[PDB]
Amino acid sequence: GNHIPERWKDYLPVGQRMPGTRFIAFKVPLQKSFEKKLAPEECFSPLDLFNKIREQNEELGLIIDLTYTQRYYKPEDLPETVPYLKIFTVGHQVPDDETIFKFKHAVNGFLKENKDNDKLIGVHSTHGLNRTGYLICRYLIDVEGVRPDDAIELFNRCRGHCLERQNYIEDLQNGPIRKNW
Ligand SMILES: [Cl-]
């Protein structure tokens, strides 16, 4: 059926917008099919997501979904008119260079199309922590010349939880810059 992903309850739904960027991170919002397995306190639907954005006084311009495990919500069912992009980030290996570029291109393609806006890119994985943290920091390091420990620190502060995966951290810090021509 619809199962609650491991440790999904153990994370703050929505982080703080990262100042100096247009990134915001959160754990997957869950469809109503999931809510029969959640106490109403544990609930976090896409509606709640859009409230928490509006309550922080921002608005979403793009949603990048990194998850693959289950249908968590349908983009069509969103309190919507925010464009959606799926970028499957699978397994525990450092996200591959192909995924890293899909992410950069989407973020780049978004900022040029919205340089007038302060509309945000909302990125989410299952917990909005590990895969999300990697990709956000990888972009900041590569594109914005932010040094690793600074990007990690910023992501962690705004998220409410520290990035966990040691191999992600190691790559952020000592791994090479992913360049293309
Ligand atoms: Cl997933």
Swiss-Prot record:
EC primary class: hydrolase
Places the protein is found: Nucleus; Nucleus speckle
Annotated catalytic residues: S125 (phosphocysteine intermediate), R131 (proton donor/acceptor)
GO CC annotations on file: fibrillar center; intercellular bridge; mitochondrion; nuclear speck; nucleoplasm; nucleus
Mutagenesis / variant outcome for changing R165K: Slightly decreases phosphatase activity with ATP. Strongly decreases phosphatase activity with ADP
Subunit structure: Monomer. May interact with SFRS7 and SFRS9/SRP30C.
Family: Belongs to the protein-tyrosine phosphatase family. Non-receptor class dual specificity subfamily.
Protein name: RNA/RNP complex-1-interacting phosphatase
Natural source organism: Homo sapiens
Gene that encodes the chain: DUSP11
Covered residues, full protein: 28 to 208 of 330
